[PDB]
Structure formats: structure tokens, C-alpha cells
Design a protein around this ligand. Sequence first.
Ligand SMILES: Nc1nc2c(ncn2[C@@H]2O[C@H](CO)[C@@H](O)[C@H]2OP(=O)(O)O)c(=O)[nH]1
Ligand code: NA
Length: 104
Amino acid sequence: ACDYTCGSNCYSSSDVSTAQAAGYKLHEDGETVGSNSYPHKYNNYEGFDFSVSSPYYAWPILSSGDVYSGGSPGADRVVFNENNQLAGVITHTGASGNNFVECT
Ligand SMILES: Nc1nc2c(ncn2[C@@H]2O[C@H](CO)[C@@H](O)[C@H]2OP(=O)(O)O)c(=O)[nH]1
Ligand code: NA
């Protein structure tokens, strides 16, 4: 099912729970993967109205269905907090520069 669309990529609630679980376990272990070092803090410069407390972390979510393991992160991210509550799914597709737009 298409529960969120980021650009032309569709992701399901399960796709999002899977991606977040991976991201949170690395957060907890205090290790990172890939050159841009994920998970990394999400600052919320954009000011999205998340309904979970900060701080937030971003972890890539991929349209191929695989869990990020370094390599190309694409434009999409699952965002979660320190308590492992999901905050939102965001993407760089449809925004200029390094900005983000929320997946809908
Ligand atoms: N637009 C934007 N980027 C952020 C924020 N917090 C961290 N970043 C990361 O900061 C980078 C630019 O300095 C953005 O591409 C993005 O990287 P990632 O997409 O790899 O997660 C934020 O609040 N807004
Ligand atoms: Na992708």
C-alpha cells in the first residue's frame, strides 16, 4: 500500500516501521553507516509540526525496499526521536538546495 508518497516513491506503514527500527538500533549503539553518517540529528530547520518531542534523528528509507547499509541514501528519510516514536517521513524531492518537504 502507498501510505506515504515522497516524490514518486511510495512507502507502506511496514516499510516505515522497518526502516525506523534499523535506524534506532544504530542510534542506540552509537554507530553510523555511510559517508554522510546516518542516523544523524535532524534539526527541523524547516519547522515541521511533528507531534513527538525533539531531539530528532534522520535515517534513509529506500524505494528498493532494502534497509540502508551505506551506499546511496536517496532523498528520503524516516525521522524518529530518542524515545523511538516516529515523527514523520521527509524527502529532499520537490524542495530546492538541501531543503526538505514532508511526504504526504
Ligand atoms: N534541510 C535540512 N537538512 C538537515 C537538517 N538537519 C540535518 N540536515 C542534514 O543537513 C544536510 C545539509 O547540511 C541536509 O542535506 C541534511 O542531510 P541528510 O539529508 O543527509 O539527512 C534540517 O533540519 N534541515
Ligand atoms: Na530511495
